[PDB]
């Protein structure tokens, strides 16, 4: 395909995010950058840290421009402080352009960098509304679109156990099978969407759909788990436990506190249920559903002849987060230009000879507009 040089441009370690190479400054300084659709700041380590192999050296970049402004970004877990500036940025396995973008030079951090992750910075791909210090700090993708011809769209194929593709400016048809189904971006801050129904092994969880989106539902490549609001999490676990009752597991397993291990290659995938989220469609009263397997929501832990897994559906107090657990099933199109997100079955998703992830529709769902939090 025409976007062939962008295929396979992502790497990572399971549970530690996916990163892309970005070349910053002049002469070039290439760094590994975590791809995060759940935040909106481009930031790179810029001082030594025990967990960093390399970092951004501003004094060596002739094109660096100091903004004389500090910046601080806290995440669900982790935080960093740094200094704002602009510099030239290219993505060597991305679009054939170079932009002048805002960059936060990370000078201090807490629980942000990860020993052995191989990444040195983060690329916040969400919208300006959630940028720090405020919405006047243009995010990277905004700069890319404003300064160049590159279409206002990117797509992510995250291939779990790590690798994948970030196609920038379009879609590559080798990365999915079947059809792309689109759900509206409800509001441009996070990539916010609306979940209208949840099933476990085809069985409706039967909660009011407002619960699923309280107080938001977002697509977040920078979060590992599928995170669910407390009431939804509790109901989901009870249903998943019931569906997998041919085996018993300790309470702490379902809470992500205990791991369970199997002899290499013997994991009984079949005893665990599939999980479906129905998403609002592009036509009135029409929805579609995405369905993931235990291969997605049971995550291999690093890492003998024993395959250990963590249950990667967890509780949230800030709404639903569709993290890697969801995304690893699918090719996900962030169609900013048309304010929609597309899902199709991923050509690289992990499955078995019995079940596959799925994206199916259309279905009929009424009053979907009421599901959203105000």
């Amino acid at each position: 395909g025409s976007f062939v040089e962008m295929v396979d441009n992502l790497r990572g370690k399971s549970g530690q995010g996916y990163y892309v190479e970005m070349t910053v400054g002049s002469p070039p300084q290439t760094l590994n950058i975590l791809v995060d659709t759940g935040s909106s700041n481009f930031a790179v380590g810029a001082a030594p840290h025990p967990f960093l192999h390399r970092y951004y050296q501003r004094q060596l970049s002739s094109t660096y421009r100091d903004l004389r402004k500090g910046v601080y970004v806290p995440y669900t877990q982790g935080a960093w402080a740094g200094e704002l500036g602009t510099d030239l940025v290219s993505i060597p396995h991305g679009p054939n352009v170079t932009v002048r973008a805002n960059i936060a030079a990370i000078t201090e951090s807490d629980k942000f960098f990860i020993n052995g992750s191989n990444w040195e910075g983060i690329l916040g791909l969400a919208y300006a509304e959630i940028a720090r210090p405020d919405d006047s700090l243009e995010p990277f993708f905004d700069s890319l679109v404003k300064q160049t011809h590159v279409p206002n769209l990117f797509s992510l194929q995250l291939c779990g156990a790590v690798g994948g593709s970030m196609i920038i400016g379009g879609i590559d048809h080798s990365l999915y099978t079947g059809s792309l189904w689109y759900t509206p971006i409800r509001r441009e801050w996070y990539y916010e969407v609306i979940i209208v129904r949840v099933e476990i092994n085809g069985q409706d969880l039967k909660m009011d759909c407002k619960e699923y989106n309280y107080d938001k539902s977002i697509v977040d490549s920078g979060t590992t788990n599928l995170r669910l609001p407390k009431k939804v999490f509790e109901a989901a676990v009870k249903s998943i436990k019931a569906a997998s009752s041919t085996e018993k597991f300790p309470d702490g397993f379902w809470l992500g506190e205990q791991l369970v291990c199997w002899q290499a290659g013997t994991t009984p995938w079949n005893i665990f249920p599939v999980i479906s989220l129905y998403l609002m469609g592009e036509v009135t009263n029409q929805s579609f559903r995405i369905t993931i397997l235990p291969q997605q929501y049971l995550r291999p832990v690093e890492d003998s002849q024993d395959d250990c897994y963590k249950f990667a559906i967890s509780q949230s107090s800030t709404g639903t987060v569709m993290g890697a657990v969801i995304m690893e099933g699918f090719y996900v199109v962030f169609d900013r230009a048309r304010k929609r997100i597309g899902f199709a079955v991923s050509a690289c998703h992990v499955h078995d000879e019995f079940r596959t992830a799925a994206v199916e529709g259309p279905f009929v769902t009424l009053d979907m507009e009421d599901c959203g939090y105000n």
Binding site: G15, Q16, G17, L34, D36, T37, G38, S39, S40, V73, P74, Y75, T76, Q77, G78, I114, I122, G124, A126, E129, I130, R132, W189, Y190, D220, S221, G222, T223, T224, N225, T318, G323
Partner: peptide, 7 residues
């Protein structure tokens, strides 16, 4: 990983 708190 668990990426924005706040926004």
């Amino acid at each position: 990983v668990q990426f924005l708190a706040x926004x």
